[PDB]
Design a protein around this ligand. Sequence first.
Ligand code: OAN
Length: 411
Amino acid sequence: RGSHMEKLAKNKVISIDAGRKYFTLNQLKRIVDKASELGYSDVHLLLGNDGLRFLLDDMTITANGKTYASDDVKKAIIEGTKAYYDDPNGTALTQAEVTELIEYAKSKDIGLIPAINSPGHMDAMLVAMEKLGIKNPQAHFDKVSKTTMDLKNEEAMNFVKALIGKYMDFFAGKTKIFNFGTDEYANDATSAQGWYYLKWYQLYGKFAEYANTLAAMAKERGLQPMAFNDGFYYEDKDDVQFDKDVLISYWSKGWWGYNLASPQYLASKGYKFLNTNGDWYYILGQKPEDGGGFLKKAIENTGKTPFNQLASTKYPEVDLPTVGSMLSIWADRPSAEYKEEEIFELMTAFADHNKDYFRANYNALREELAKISKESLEALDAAKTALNYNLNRNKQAELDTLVANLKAALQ
Ligand SMILES: CC(=O)N[C@H]1/C(=N/OC(=O)Nc2ccccc2)O[C@H](CO)[C@@H](O)[C@@H]1O
């Protein structure tokens, strides 16, 4: 049970699935603002998750000894993403929009953590590849996957690695972490038994090297690699080795015949966790009747599930090292309406149940600071000096008073 300092140093992350579904820059700014207000440290933004919803200004890709022109890559990606879900609200964020988003979050002490999913959840990239002349990028098992790249297809792999590298190059120097996903390999084509299928066809070693290369690409570009736990040391076996520097976003140990590594086992291999507990999931539009991650359950679970409790473990009987925790908003059915206040209420309850971990609200202090002769310059200083930047969410009134004193002095 940490000191105030340890508690505040942990990441508090709100995750938004803008891979499946379009979110405007304004919508994401409002999320950033609300995250800042409630005391979160980061917004985790999925840009590639099924749909690919982010184009750089220059999308020229070099791979397979060949060159794929920027205009063609954009067109193919737009077609890929539209084939997955032609969202009426928009298709993809631009490079200027994400740059502005990052610079807005930074002004509020909020990090951005981008996620570009592969080799699963990459519907949009698969079709984009077909459009660029890359035949059969899809995994084939019980049927031809719509979500997952064939690991035997070197043409497709090289392209995707080049694509992901250009994304990484953009986020280099702008964000600390890059999440490359790897959750649910070929779920759609194996009845959600993808890992078993990879092991069956002796392609799991091939998955690992793919995962290890993305990890290496991230580190080389000065980005801390992150990935979902699913495909790491599946079934607690270690004949296939994984990069030990990946931050594991741990969400679940899986279900009958989806026998993921335990958090105990990954901690024994040296891993650090971002606690992305499935208990906190909310899928837009999910009703109580539907079961699963509906709003009332997620809200209840921010109460029942301790901040540090990794899925499948009881806290504190099992106490594993985490850098923080992440509450996740998903868009499984992307035509469900995004209701801002649902997300806000859920964000609020997670903060309200963990006040020791969340910062106080510094938006009014910032607003006041940017408003700035005699012994009245002496006063403005003594108020400036009395500012405390270390206050948690339990101490908002204390902060309000310090801000009130500084307002007084500036008048
Ligand atoms: C890492 C993660 O949360 N992956 C998927 C996800 N996986 O949740 C599962 O429980 N998936 C699952 C179901 C059956 C067998 C194996 C995995 O949940 C979110 C909400 O449904 C989806 O948006 C995600 O894409």
